[PDB]
Design a binder for this molecule. Structure first.
Ligand code: VHW
Length: 254
């Protein structure tokens, strides 16, 4: 069986555009981080009460996510098809995918050496303990780390990694999308590119199964999203929380 058709002219171009959007929107040197509000790591050895009293890492991480949303918006805008949607649908998709794409894209800094996101330094190394000092609990953090490892062990080529993010953003089943049929047309073009790319480029491959595993990651992302969203909502009850955020974070996760 096992047909392995060549990438079409168009699929090739779609992949080139995606790699190029990603290279322009993902700086692997983390050179902008010194501009974020500074990481503050005060001893939290415990403790929800202290956590919430301090939120010591929230300004730095909020700026990091905020900056990251901005990069995601730009990335989305260079997805072939994205511009063809109404601006209303573009935004519905951006807001409901943003934290998910952040979790995907963050995989590039995540490292299995010590199960951190290493954006350089030790100032810009983020661990479980740093994410609890932003107010999150282990109900989100532990599956997030599991997802990050799960995803590292797919050993995605960068083509797959950027198609996956593109497919994540352009989902016809998001609440409040007006032209589900268009969005789906676009996702299918993107999915067919990924299915085709995998069959072409991936060794062995009796393990065409990578596609199933990639698709399952998108489903893990919905659970992480809803969990992050529960926790964000509880955090926004913390008086002065909003100082610690940014207007964009407030709109997107609000
Ligand atoms: C964000 C990125 C990076 C690390 C991501 C991380 C590490 C820190 C905690 C985060 C952010 C999680 C955490 C559960 C989510 C949080 C914590 C606090 C924040 C603030 C809004 C929150 O809600 O707290 C209440 C939030 O959503 C979700 C993803 C986590 C570095 C780099 O690879 C990229 O960045 C590199 C730029 C290159 O383009 C990428 O874009």
């Amino acid at each position: 069986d096992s047909l392995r058709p060549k990438l079409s002219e168009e699929q090739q171009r779609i992949i080139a555009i995606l790699l190029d959007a990603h290279h322009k929107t993902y700086d692997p040197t983390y050179s902008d981080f010194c501009q974020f509000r500074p990481p503050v790591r005060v001893n939290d050895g415990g403790s929800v009460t202290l956590e919430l009293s301090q939120l010591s890492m929230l300004p730095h991480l909020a700026d990091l996510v905020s900056y990251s949303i901005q990069k995601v918006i730009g990335f989305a805008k260079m997805i072939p098809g994205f511009r063809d949607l109404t601006s209303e649908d573009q935004i519905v998709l951006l807001k409901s995918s943003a934290i998910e794409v952040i979790m995907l894209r963050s995989n590039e800094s995540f490292t299995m050496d010590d199960m951190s996101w290493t954006c350089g330094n030790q100032d810009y190394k983020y661990r479980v303990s740093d994410v609890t000092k932003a107010g999150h609990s282990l109900e989100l953090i532990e599956p997030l780390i599991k997802f990050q490892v799960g995803l590292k062990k797919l050993n995605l080529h960068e083509e797959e990694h950027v198609l996956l993010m593109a497919i994540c953003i352009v989902s016809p089943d998001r609440p409040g999308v007006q032209d589900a049929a268009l969005i789906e047309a676009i996702q299918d073009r993107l999915s067919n590119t990924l299915q085709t790319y995998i069959r072409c480029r991936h060794p062995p491959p009796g393990s065409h199964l990578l596609y199933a595993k990639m698709i399952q990651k998108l489903a893990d992302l919905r659970s992480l999203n809803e969990e992050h969203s529960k926790q964000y909502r509880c955090l926004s009850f913390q008086p002065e929380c909003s100082m610690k955020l940014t207007p964009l974070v407030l709109e997107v996760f609000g």
